[PDB]
Amino acid sequence: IVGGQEAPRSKWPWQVSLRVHGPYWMHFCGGSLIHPQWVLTAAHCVGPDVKDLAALRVQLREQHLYYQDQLLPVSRIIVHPQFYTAQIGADIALLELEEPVKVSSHVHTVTLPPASETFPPGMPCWVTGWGDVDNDERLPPPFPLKQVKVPIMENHICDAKYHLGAYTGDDVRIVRDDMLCAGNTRRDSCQGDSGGPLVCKVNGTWLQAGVVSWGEGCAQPNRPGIYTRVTYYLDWIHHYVPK
Amino acid sequence: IVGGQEAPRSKWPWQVSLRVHGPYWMHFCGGSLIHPQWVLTAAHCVGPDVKDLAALRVQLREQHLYYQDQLLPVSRIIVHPQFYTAQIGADIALLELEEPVKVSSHVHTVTLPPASETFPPGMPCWVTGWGDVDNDERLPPPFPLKQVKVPIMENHICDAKYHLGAYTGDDVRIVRDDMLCAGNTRRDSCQGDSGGPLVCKVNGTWLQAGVVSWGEGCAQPNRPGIYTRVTYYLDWIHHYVPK
Amino acid sequence: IVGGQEAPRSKWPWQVSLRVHGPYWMHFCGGSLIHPQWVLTAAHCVGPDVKDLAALRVQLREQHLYYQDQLLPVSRIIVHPQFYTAQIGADIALLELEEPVKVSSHVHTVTLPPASETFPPGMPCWVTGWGDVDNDERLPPPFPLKQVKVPIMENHICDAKYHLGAYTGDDVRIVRDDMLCAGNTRRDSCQGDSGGPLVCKVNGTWLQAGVVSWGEGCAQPNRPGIYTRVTYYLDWIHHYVPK
Amino acid sequence: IVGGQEAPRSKWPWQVSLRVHGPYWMHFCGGSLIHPQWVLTAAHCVGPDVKDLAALRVQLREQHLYYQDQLLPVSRIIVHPQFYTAQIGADIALLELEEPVKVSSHVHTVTLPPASETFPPGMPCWVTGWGDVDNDERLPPPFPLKQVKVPIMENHICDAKYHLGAYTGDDVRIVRDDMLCAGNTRRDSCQGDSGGPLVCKVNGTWLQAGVVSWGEGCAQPNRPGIYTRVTYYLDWIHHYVPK
Numbered sequence: 025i026v027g028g029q030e031a032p033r034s035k036w037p038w039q040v041s042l043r044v045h046g047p048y049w050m051h052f053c054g055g056s057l058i059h060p061q062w063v064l065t066a067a068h069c070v071g072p073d074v075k076d077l078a079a080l081r082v083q084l085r086e087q088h089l090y091y092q093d094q095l096l097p098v099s100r101i102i103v104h105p106q107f108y109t110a111q112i113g114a115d116i117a118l119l120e121l122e123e124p125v126k127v128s129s130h131v132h133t134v135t136l137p138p139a140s141e142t143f144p145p146g147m148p149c150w151v152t153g154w155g156d157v158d159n160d161e162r163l164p165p166p167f168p169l170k171q172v173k174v175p176i177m178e179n180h181i182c183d184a185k186y187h188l189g190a191y192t193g194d195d196v197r198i199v200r201d202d203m204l205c206a207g208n209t210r211r212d213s214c215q216g217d218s219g220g221p222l223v224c225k226v227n228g229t230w231l232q233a234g235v236v237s238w239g240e241g242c243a244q245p246n247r248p249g250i251y252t253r254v255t256y257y258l259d260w261i262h263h264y265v266p267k
Numbered sequence: 268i269v270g271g272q273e274a275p276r277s278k279w280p281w282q283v284s285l286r287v288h289g290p291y292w293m294h295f296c297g298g299s300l301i302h303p304q305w306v307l308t309a310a311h312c313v314g315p316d317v318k319d320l321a322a323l324r325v326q327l328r329e330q331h332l333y334y335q336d337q338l339l340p341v342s343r344i345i346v347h348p349q350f351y352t353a354q355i356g357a358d359i360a361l362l363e364l365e366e367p368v369k370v371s372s373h374v375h376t377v378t379l380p381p382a383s384e385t386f387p388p389g390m391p392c393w394v395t396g397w398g399d400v401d402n403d404e405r406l407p408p409p410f411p412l413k414q415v416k417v418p419i420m421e422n423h424i425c426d427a428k429y430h431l432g433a434y435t436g437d438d439v440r441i442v443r444d445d446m447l448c449a450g451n452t453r454r455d456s457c458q459g460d461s462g463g464p465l466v467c468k469v470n471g472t473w474l475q476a477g478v479v480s481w482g483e484g485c486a487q488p489n490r491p492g493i494y495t496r497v498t499y500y501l502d503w504i505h506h507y508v509p510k
Numbered sequence: 511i512v513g514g515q516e517a518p519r520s521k522w523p524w525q526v527s528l529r530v531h532g533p534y535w536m537h538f539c540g541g542s543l544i545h546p547q548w549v550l551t552a553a554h555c556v557g558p559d560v561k562d563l564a565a566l567r568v569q570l571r572e573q574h575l576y577y578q579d580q581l582l583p584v585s586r587i588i589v590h591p592q593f594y595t596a597q598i599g600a601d602i603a604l605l606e607l608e609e610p611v612k613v614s615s616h617v618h619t620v621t622l623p624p625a626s627e628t629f630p631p632g633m634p635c636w637v638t639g640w641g642d643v644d645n646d647e648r649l650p651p652p653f654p655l656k657q658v659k660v661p662i663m664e665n666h667i668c669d670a671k672y673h674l675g676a677y678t679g680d681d682v683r684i685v686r687d688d689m690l691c692a693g694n695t696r697r698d699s700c701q702g703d704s705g706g707p708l709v710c711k712v713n714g715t716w717l718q719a720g721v722v723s724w725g726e727g728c729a730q731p732n733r734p735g736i737y738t739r740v741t742y743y744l745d746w747i748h749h750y751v752p753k
Numbered sequence: 754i755v756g757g758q759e760a761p762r763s764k765w766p767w768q769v770s771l772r773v774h775g776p777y778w779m780h781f782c783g784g785s786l787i788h789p790q791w792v793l794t795a796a797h798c799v800g801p802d803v804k805d806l807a808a809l810r811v812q813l814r815e816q817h818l819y820y821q822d823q824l825l826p827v828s829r830i831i832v833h834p835q836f837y838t839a840q841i842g843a844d845i846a847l848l849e850l851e852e853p854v855k856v857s858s859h860v861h862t863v864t865l866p867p868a869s870e871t872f873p874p875g876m877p878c879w880v881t882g883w884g885d886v887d888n889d890e891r892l893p894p895p896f897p898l899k900q901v902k903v904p905i906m907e908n909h910i911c912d913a914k915y916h917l918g919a920y921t922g923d924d925v926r927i928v929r930d931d932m933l934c935a936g937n938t939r940r941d942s943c944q945g946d947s948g949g950p951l952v953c954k955v956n957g958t959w960l961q962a963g964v965v966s967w968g969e970g971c972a973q974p975n976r977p978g979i980y981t982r983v984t985y986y987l988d989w990i991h992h993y994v995p996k
């Protein structure tokens with residue numbers, strides 16, 4: 025998270041951390057609990073290639089990474105079939121926990137948006153995670169969960185910015201329709217935040233608008249962060265996650 | 268280059284080395300002289316973001332990189348307007364040298380394939396370069412130009428391979444039509460070879476069938492090297508390169 | 511610490527961590543509280559070149575590094591005047607805190623041994639710290655304080671071991687008289703433990719016999735850990751530290 | 754070598770490169786040919802621990818590292834029995850080749866100085882090698898042999914400087930008698946040059962005054978380079994190398 029602040033313990037009850045087996049269960053991506061038994065994340069975090077489930081674990085909200093670990097095993101990894109790379113699209117996936125989780129005010133699910141939600145510019149949205157605080161700058165220990173308010177912009181505006189300083193032809197779509205963009209040169213998500221949630225409060229209810237996907241670097245000029253647009257894959261999600 | 272060996276001094280007179288300005292003019296990509304004043308290379312080697320010409324130089328046929336350097340300045344970088352990332356496609360670019368080169372028996376152009384030429388799956392082809400000799404392991408000094416015979420494979424059979432051990436839906440194209448693939452678990456091109464040439468001797472004449480583009484790792488199981496199919500962009504090339 | 515395990519939080523109340531100013535207050539060495547206002551450590555941790563006090567901080571007994579930080583400023587750094595390199599000797603220093611600490615059962619001083627104490631070979635002693643768990647192997651987060659029981663070795667025997675597999679003449683002293691040594695191929699102190707304490711329980715009382723100094727790798731055959739013999743510099747310590 | 758230039762082919766015929774077996778025969782130290790079958794180098798380059806002679810080879814003068822390798826095997830490695838660390842002293846060693854080499858104008862031995870040679874300040878000398886061109890700055894390919902004229906200064910002068918900005922007592926000698934000192938903030942030898950030679954033209958004849966040994970960094974303020982004083986170990990050398 026670029027330009028944020030440590031998040032209060034009472035916020036982002038849905039934030040999760042994905043861990044891969046190694047010298048220690050290291051965090052590689054974020055995600056979000058959307059159901060007692062399901063975690064939503066980015067497909068590039070766990071695919072496109074099939075991985076060994078055993079070498080994967082999920083950590084529920086933690087104020088500081090690695091501090092109070094209580095790792096949960098994963099029974100299933102479900103990656104959107106249309107995915108291959110984040111730039112192309114469909115950067116979304118689901119993780120089924122081996123056992124349901126017990127929710128509480130400190131740990132519970134995030135609300136998914138109705139298929140019609142647009143999240144127009146000027147909407148209050150936040151992104152969270154344990155990613156780098158800047159390009160090539162990792163979050164230093166004790167690794168606090170960070171949060172930053174990001175400005176949402178229209179897809180066509182970001183698409184135009186990505187073409188500035190690029191050879192890519194103006195009519196060749198970069199920021200696609202199943203994507204959503206936010207952030208600026210002071211506020212953005214970064215490496216390590218992938219898979220994490222981008223949420224906005226709409227009428228007193230927090231809705232996950234996106235999943236941290238990609239971007240050219242972090243908080244760089246004319247290169248706002250790109251997120252997978254959740255409303256675009258609601259149907260797919262519901263083919264696995266009950267209402 | 269993985270699984271090959273040092274190229275005889277008289278082979279591959281078209282191989283070129285791309286250099287970027289730093290503590291020393293370091294190699295970052297390969298290329299091929301397709302005209303006295305034009306170098307064909309991979310777009311991802313010099314884009315999508317605009318580069319500074321001042322920082323680029325071209326080095327012609329060299330037995331050992333950095334040894335007998337005679338850097339040539341570039342006048343213009345033409346990156347196919349449809350290019351954004353290698354996986355998407357149109358990974359091809361042109362480099363117009365500031366002066367034509369005096370071709371010789373030891374250093375001269377390679378012949379482009381005719382628009383109808385269709386390198387049959389199995390064709391004896393060769394790829395060359397100074398790229399890694401294996402995944403994550405560089406070419407050791409004195410950096411000799413390497414070569415390796417690789418078998419060309421049918422696009423469909425390749426696309427199918429890339430889906431093996433992957434979540435990507437079978438009907439979702441990974442190896443696209445403007446691409447070509449070649450190599451196996453023992454022979455392939457690697458990081459450092461990008462933009463380099465994949466040449467095949469057909470009817471007693473060397474034709475450049477492709478440009479080293481991308482691939483999952485090097486010489487990995489069911490992950491053959493992907494190259495930008497040259498025949499596919501012949502018209503775009505000829506829009507700039509004479510005859 | 512190689513071998514051994516995480517330390518119960520009621521053990522080693524004198525262990526401290528030295529921090530240096532950077533992106534965060536990073537641990538670079540260990541130490542021990544030998545007086546409410548004095549920390550005993552290794553000279554090579556803070557010299558031979560003069561350092562900037564502003565960039566130094568001391569952290570008292572922590573179960574997991576960086577998690578419950580309460581950095582204490584340092585008012586003086588006294589490096590033994592005879593010190594230049596660890597292999598030469600006199601690898602010992604004193605840090606004078608800016609304020610005495612409120613000792614408790616959880617955090618309090620360790621006892622220096624009497625000038626007579628010798629600590630016989632094959633003595634039950636323990637060394638503690640956050641150093642590497644093995645050669646080139648960092649202590650993984652959450653960075654628990656580790657401990658390991660190591661056997662004291664007679665100086666002559668150590669010096670002798672260090673000559674095995676070496677060109678150094680047998681009569682040339684490697685492990686000097688102001689040094690002490692302990693450990694084996696399974697248990698030892700490692701990079702990051704320097705300045706740390708080596709305590710032994712004598713007559714039912716914990717005394718600091720050594721300060722982690724140097725060694726050839728960690729837990730390597732015929733290469734036991736070398737420590738600055740404390741009894742050898744008691745006089746120097748007591749010139750500054752109240753009896 | 755810091756602050757020099759590429760050496761002409763006709764100079765430093767005695768310069769040698771030591772190679773360690775690995776992915777390729779990598780340079781790790783310099784040396785000098787003092788006899789058709791003997792090479793003089795630094796003890797810290799090959800000791801204090803005994804090494805596998807098989808994993809070692811010597812390369813005679815080369816204009817560019819790795820390009821014209823003609824590696825020579827070593828039969829014996831003789832290290833001064835007084836050696837343990839460079840700061841302590843006796844940083845000298847001998848390498849006996851398996852076969853005598855053929856001498857010529859391009860490659861021949863260097864003359865050792867008479868026991869009474871002092872090499873007083875003022876008198877210009879040169880140091881050569883393939884080491885770093887600055888602190889943490891590697892010699893770039895094609896790795897040319899560099900040379901640089903260094904100013905020699907009296908031992909007590911350099912010792913005083915080594916004490917500036919250091920806690921080491923002024924009477925604890927740093928630059929020892931068996932050592933020699935040269936270089937300044939713009940001219941010096943650096944990592945990789947170790948074991949190489951420091952030669953001075955005396956009476957029309959070139960004499961090796963020292964062997965690159967150590968220094969705090971390279972070309973740093975009040976930290977001139979330190980070399981092993983050859984005249985101090987003549988007797989030892991002659992116990993092995995014919996007169």
Ligand SMILES: *[C@@](O)(c1noc(CN2CCN(C(=O)CCCc3ccccc3)CC2)n1)[C@H](CCCCN)NC(=O)OCc1ccccc1
Nearest residue numbers: 044052069075079080213214215216217218237238239249
């Ligand atoms: C993300 O935060 C981010 N950071 O790193 C990544 C890439 N990701 C690739 C897949 N990973 C692994 O190889 C290990 C798999 C562990 C595992 C084992 C067993 C089962 C399941 C899993 C983990 C690392 N992604 C950034 C966010 C950008 C924010 C900009 N505003 N995204 C990113 O870097 O994207 C592009 C990308 C994609 C793939 C590789 C490199 C770069």
Ligand SMILES: *[C@@](O)(c1noc(CN2CCN(C(=O)CCCc3ccccc3)CC2)n1)[C@H](CCCCN)NC(=O)OCc1ccccc1
Nearest residue numbers: 287311312318322323456457458459460461480481482492
């Ligand atoms: C290639 O060998 C390869 N290796 O690295 C690359 C990526 N390339 C990106 C563009 N580069 C730069 O940003 C620096 C530009 C310097 C410059 C300055 C001024 C003017 C002009 C230039 C250089 C590095 N490509 C591999 C070969 C695959 C072999 C498989 N069998 N290709 C590859 O990695 O492709 C996919 C890809 C595409 C873009 C980025 C990363 C990866």
Ligand SMILES: *[C@@](O)(c1noc(CN2CCN(C(=O)CCCc3ccccc3)CC2)n1)[C@H](CCCCN)NC(=O)OCc1ccccc1
Nearest residue numbers: 530538554555561566699700701702703704723724725735
């Ligand atoms: C020690 O654990 C150890 N680990 O690292 C070291 C070396 N030490 C050098 C001095 N340091 C710094 O440069 C930073 C100074 C920060 C500072 C700023 C401002 C004020 C005060 C301080 C810190 C790192 N020492 C091992 C233990 C060996 C155990 C074997 N069983 N010892 C070691 O490595 O010793 C030899 C040595 C000495 C100096 C350098 C390298 C190696």
Ligand SMILES: *[C@@](O)(c1noc(CN2CCN(C(=O)CCCc3ccccc3)CC2)n1)[C@H](CCCCN)NC(=O)OCc1ccccc1
Nearest residue numbers: 773781799804808809942943944945946947966967968978
């Ligand atoms: C020297 O140029 C220098 N450069 O590197 C070194 C250290 N040396 C350590 C031992 N080496 C090896 O591990 C490989 C052994 C190969 C081998 C195989 C088989 C048989 C025999 C040998 C080689 C590298 N020393 C500098 C000169 C400084 C000049 C300043 N004006 N000296 C230096 O760096 O010294 C301190 C030092 C010592 C050991 C490690 C790091 C630093």
